């Protein structure tokens, strides 16, 4: 299951849900600008 907002993630293997992206500073899912 994909990862929702503010869940811990890995930018190199980004499993954040559609429209989200793994933050490089915090490594949690944030809104994709």
């Amino acid at each position: 299951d994909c990862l929702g907002m503010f869940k811990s993630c890995d930018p190199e293997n980004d499993k954040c849900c559609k429209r989200l992206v793994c933050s490089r500073s915090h490594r949690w899912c944030k809104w994709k600008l």
Partner: antibody
Amino acid sequence: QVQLQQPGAELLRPGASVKLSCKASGYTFTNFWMNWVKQRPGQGLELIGMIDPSDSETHYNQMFKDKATLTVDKSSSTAYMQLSSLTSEDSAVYYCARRDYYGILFDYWGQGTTVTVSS
Amino acid sequence: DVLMTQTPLSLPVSLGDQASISCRSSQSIVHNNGNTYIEWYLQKPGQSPKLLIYKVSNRFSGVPDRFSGSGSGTDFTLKISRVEAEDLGVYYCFQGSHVPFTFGSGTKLEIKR
């Protein structure tokens, strides 16, 4: 080729301010974190702060929170670092550095601007 | 902010011998995502730093087996085996896990001859 262009050297008077420039080329400027690093003669590297040029999200190291201000100009792909009320303690080499796309390492560096604070 | 201490502050080493540099953090460098973002940089006089090791033990492109990074949690080590004359300079550890990211104090490797 990823390149970060910084002026080699600047001489400033005590009490003045300076806005250091780091001109990025050869990559998508808004998609990589920019970092500024201070290094006094014969001393260590000190991270000043970092900025995400896409939305100017900033994070400052505690020593520089009140002292440094990070901004970007998207139209010229330039990162800036402003210091105010300069003293001889501010004489140092100031580097800009790019974080890689995945946020796991610094991949490219400017050549550093040596600031001299002197009358 | 997270403190990164290096020991020793300077390290004289004979050619062919091994140099070992310790990096200790004030807080675990394990991230909430389970990864550990420790990097090692080498700086030569008058030059910008260059990356050697990232994520504790990953060697950057072209960096030989003889540069080895290890450790976990709060304690990390860079070992440089079979030291060469050109290895002199200041080695810095760095943590990129906890904002704001921080550099270690630096260790100056000097060559004995």
